[PDB]
Amino acid sequence: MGPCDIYEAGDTPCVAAHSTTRALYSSFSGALYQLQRGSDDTTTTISPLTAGGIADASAQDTFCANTTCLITIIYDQSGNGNHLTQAPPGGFDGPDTDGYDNLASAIGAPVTLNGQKAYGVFMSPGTGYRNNEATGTATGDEAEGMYAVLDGTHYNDACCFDYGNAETSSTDTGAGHMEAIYLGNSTTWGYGAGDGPWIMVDMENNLFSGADEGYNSGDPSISYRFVTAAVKGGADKWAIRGANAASGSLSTYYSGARPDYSGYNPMSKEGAIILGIGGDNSNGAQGTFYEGVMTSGYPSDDTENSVQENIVAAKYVVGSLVSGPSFTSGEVVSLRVTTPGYTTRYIAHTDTTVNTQVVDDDSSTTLKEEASWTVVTGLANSQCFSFESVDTPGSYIRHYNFELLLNANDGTKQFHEDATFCPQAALNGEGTSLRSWSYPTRYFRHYENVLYAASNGGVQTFDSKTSFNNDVSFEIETAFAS
Ligand SMILES: *[C@@H]1O[C@H](CO)[C@@H](O[C@@H]2O[C@H](CO)[C@@H](O)[C@H](O)[C@H]2NC(C)=O)[C@H](O)[C@H]1NC(C)=O
């Protein structure tokens, strides 16, 4: 049995089931999600290898070879048609065309389930999915349960990395008009103990970590690489239960009556489904979604325990984020442009601006150093890497407003994430392509001889698809600074 077979047996059937990694029903063999590649904007679907099995990652790799891919749709496996598509603008506009939120990269969250390769949904700030015409989802004060397997190490404090029930108008219609899982360390509303992140329940105009608005000591920080967040709500009752998705049981962080504030009892759920954003489309949060469902009815603890048992059995393990030549920590290199007509240029920097310049044996000692980089273990992820300036030790290449800058490491999580890049076999076959760890839809890309963290097509001029593949491919050579 799969998670939804378990919920069905527990008398609280799934009304929405989403996952890019595996089938959530033992009998499901349909499409798990849809992909769209940047080379020609064509699409294709990825289905389980077998009924109730793991996604066919090989099919994705084949379709996405020598180009970039986006996850356009996360299909609803229940049959209710509650598929998740690109989230629309609402109370807040997204950063994409006409206010839509960004689609997620198809390769930002590689994993293996019991040894089989699969891809999760790595969501950077601005990314979001939604379905504002869902069927079967609880409305009003109707009871529902839900869970999601997330990455407890991928999060931030901006509103709001949610998965669950929200408004069908994509706007904030008041307290009680939402009921969704939240994972992050926002403290604007509720928050738990420690540094976070915390699993909280977004009931609109409030993220709740317990009965009181604001701080609630009963909700602990949970930072497992794979987190199972289980939330449920019914008539004047709700609960938060969490666990290490890779091992053990769910622990109850909260179970009791609704927060005693106007609008939360009875609830006024609208039934829309959101992923990675807030009800009003607040889109500043980040996180990773692997699988999750929403049910009709209030799940018993026993039913959820069986679901957690199943998740553990799926055996989630982190996958490889790197491919191609790659590097070794401590190694010093110079990166050469491969785009025809700019092949004598190297990645360098003029003060804080990262750019490309013609550097050769005749260059000054200073310029040779500005075109030389010490490759160190990724500041935000040990699999990837960070690039430290040779002339300016202590400073690394980092993206800011999608421009690559050379700034001093302040030791903060944010800097670390902005400064971590994962090597990928060059899209044009020449060398390597450095993919941003925090924004996997973006890569080192030279445009007008300046370096950016650009996507294959986008709202920024430097996201131009023209010569993208060549512009994000660099040959790794001996450092000029020796
Ligand atoms: C959420 O967690 C992060 C990570 O611990 C906090 O970020 C730090 O941010 C402050 C404020 O900018 C800096 O003094 C620290 O140097 C940062 N620490 C790290 C480890 O990066 C963030 O402040 C937290 N947010 C809230 C609202 O509590």
| Nearest of 124, 359, 172 to residue 280 by alpha carbon | 172
Q: Is the peptide bond before 197 cis (omega within 30 degrees of 0)?
A: yes
* Angle, vertex CA 263, rays to CA 262 and CA 266, nearest 5: 115
- Cα 184 to Cα 110: distance, rounded to the nearest angstrom: 21
- Fold match, 1-320 / 321-482: no
Give me the catalytic one of 76, 162, 219, 280: 280
Report, in this order, helix, strand and coil percent for the chain, each rounded to 5. Answer: 10, 40, 50
Pocket test for ligand 1, best of 413, 414, 416 (most atoms within 8 A of CB): 413
Could you tell me the residue ranges of all domains in the chain? 1-320, 321-482
Burial of 58: CB neighbours in 10 Å, binned 0-12, 13-18, 19+: exposed
- State the distance from the centre of ligand 1 to the C-alpha of 394, rounded, in angstroms: 20
- Cα 132 to Cα 32: distance, rounded to the nearest angstrom: 20
| Number of the ligand 1 atom closest to the C-alpha atom of 186 | 27
- State the distance from the centre of ligand 1 to the C-alpha of 185, rounded, in angstroms: 9
CA dihedral 210, 283, 234, 173 (to 10 degrees): 110
In this structure, which residue's CA is closest to atom 10 in ligand 1? 412
Give me the catalytic one of 151, 204, 369, 471: 204
CB count in 10 Å sphere of residue 92: 18
Q: Which letter does DSSP use for residue 430 in this model?
A: S
CB count in 10 Å sphere of residue 392: 16
Breaks in the chain (C to N > 2.5 A) come right after none
In this structure, which residue's CA is closest to atom 22 in ligand 1? 157
Pocket test for ligand 1, best of 155, 182, 414 (most atoms within 8 A of CB): 414
In this structure, which residue's CA is closest to atom 12 in ligand 1? 412
Q: Which letter does DSSP use for residue 294 in this model?
A: E
In this structure, which residue's CA is closest to atom 14 in ligand 1? 412
- Cα 112 to Cα 54: distance, rounded to the nearest angstrom: 9
Q: What CATH number is given for 1-320 in this structure?
A: 2.60.120.200
What is the secondary structure of 123-184 as a DSSP string? E-TTB-EEESS-SS---BT--EEEEEEE-TTS--SSS--EEEEE-TTSS---TTS-EEEEEE
Judged by phi (left if over 0) then psi (alpha if -120 to 50, else beta), residue 431 lies in left
- Cα 243 to Cα 236: distance, rounded to the nearest angstrom: 24
In this structure, which residue's CA is closest to atom 28 in ligand 1? 187
| Number of the ligand 1 atom closest to the C-alpha atom of 156 | 1
In the PDB record, what is the listed experimental method?
Answer: X-ray
In this structure, which residue's CA is closest to atom 4 in ligand 1? 413
- State the distance from the centre of ligand 1 to the C-alpha of 187, rounded, in angstroms: 11
Place of tokens 């993208």: 468
| Number of the ligand 1 atom closest to the C-alpha atom of 184 | 1
Containing 311, the helix (H) or strand (E) segment is helix 301-314
Report residue 216 as tokens: 């609630």
Spell out the residues 6+ positions from residue 266 whose beta carbon is closer than 8 angstroms to its own. 140, 141, 176, 235, 236
- Cα 119 to Cα 107: distance, rounded to the nearest angstrom: 6
Q: Which letter does DSSP use for residue 47 in this model?
A: -
Spell out the residues 6+ positions from residue 401 whose beta carbon is closer than 8 angstroms to its own. none
Phi, psi (rounded to 5 degrees) for 70: -125, 150
Note if 280 is an active site residue: yes
Note if 204 is an active site residue: yes
What is the secondary structure of 396-423 as a DSSP string? EEEEETTEEEEEE----HHHHHHT-EEE
CATH architecture of 321-482: Trefoil (2.80)
* Max Cα distance, the chain (Å): 76
- State the distance from the centre of ligand 1 to the C-alpha of 202, rounded, in angstroms: 22
| Nearest of 173, 170, 179 to residue 200 by alpha carbon | 179
- State the distance from the centre of ligand 1 to the C-alpha of 254, rounded, in angstroms: 25
| Nearest of 273, 305, 317, 272 to residue 292 by alpha carbon | 273
Q: Which residues line ligand 1 (CB under 6 A)?
A: 157, 185, 187, 195-196, 412-413
Task: Name the residue type at position 336.
Answer: R
Spell out the residues 6+ positions from residue 85 whose beta carbon is closer than 8 angstroms to its own. 72, 73, 129, 130, 131
Report residue 261 as tokens: 């504030």
In this structure, which residue's CA is closest to atom 19 in ligand 1? 412
| Number of the ligand 1 atom closest to the C-alpha atom of 185 | 1
Task: Give how far Cα 48 sits from Cα of 17, 25, 28, 33, Å.
Answer: 14, 11, 8, 10
| Number of the ligand 1 atom closest to the C-alpha atom of 412 | 21
Provide the CA 284 distance to its chain's centre, in angstroms.
12
